[PDB]
Each structure stands twice: as structure tokens, then as C-alpha cells.
Amino acid sequence: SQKAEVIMNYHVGETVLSLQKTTLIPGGSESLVYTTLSGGIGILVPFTSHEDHDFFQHVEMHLRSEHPPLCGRDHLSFRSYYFPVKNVIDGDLCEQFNSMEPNKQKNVSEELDRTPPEVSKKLEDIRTRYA
């Protein structure tokens, strides 16, 4: 018959029992806020420009192999627990940039041809816009 198709897949690791797409702050944009039985609340934000998307993708790809998790868990395999991740970028790994060592921050900034203040401002722009 007319079978449907899947365009997104993600694994938060916690049971979700509520979904709603509204606007949190006045004068904002339509975001996909969700809550979990554990107690955490998260949102999903769509990208605006392709330059930001590729910059974030490169940052995440570098940080996946440069900043391994504390417990030695494969982050890509953990996110692709049941199904492969499709068109989703994890924001926690990007936000972990601030608490990194200065030497590794300098190295990754030189690799990306950017300055750490610029990277921090770019990361915080999304949070300021969508919160």
C-alpha cells in the first residue's frame, strides 16, 4: 500500500510521555519542547543557514574523537542505540566546549580556523535565540 517513511531518528535514553510544539518565550520561534519521566526537559531547534549546520557538524565530528566520554562509551553507538541517528546534532557535546582544557581548545580552534571566543559566541547564539 501507500507505506510511510521516516525522516528523523534519535535516542535520548529516557522515556518520553509528552510532546508539544509551541513557543516558550514571547516573540520567539516554534520549537519542539518535550518532557521525560526522568524529569529532564529538552527542546529541538531547526537550523537556519547551511554554514552554521556544517560548522556545527564539523565541531561535533572533531569532538567525538577528540573528547571521548568519561565512562568509555561510544557516543555515536549510544545515540544509534536502536536506530541510526538521522539529521540530528547533539548539543551537549558542543556545549562541553567551555569546560575543556585550554591547550585542546587552542588546538581545535586552530584546526577550525576560528577563535575560541568566536566559537563560544556562535554556540551561545542558538541558546540566546531559543530560550
Partner: protein, 71 residues
Amino acid sequence: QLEHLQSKYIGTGHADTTKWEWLVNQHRDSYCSYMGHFDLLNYFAIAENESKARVRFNLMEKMLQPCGPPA
């Protein structure tokens, strides 16, 4: 001849594996997965008004002979 990988594991099937052992192994693995996860157990704890310890005890003494008696 290169089959030693499938001989040193628990729950691996073979040519003459019937339905009962496969289903009981599936049930055991499902119960182990239930025990391992935290929110998947919290869902059960919220669903029925018991505590975590009672659910864990029920799962522990439900792993012995699930899916009924053998045949």
C-alpha cells in the same frame, strides 16, 4: 570449521532448536533488559502502586521458569 564463535555464547541457536527454548531465552533476555534499564523500570513502578524493590523481586523470582512448564 570456523564456528567456535557461535559455540562459546549463551542462548545461541542451532539446527534443531525448537520454539520453547527460543521463547524462554527471549523472555530471559527481555527480563534482563528490563532490570538493566532505569526509566523502563520507573515506568513499571509508576504504572502499578508498588516500589522498586518489589518489582525487582518479582522479576528475580520470575526468571526461573517463565513461559510455563517445559514439554
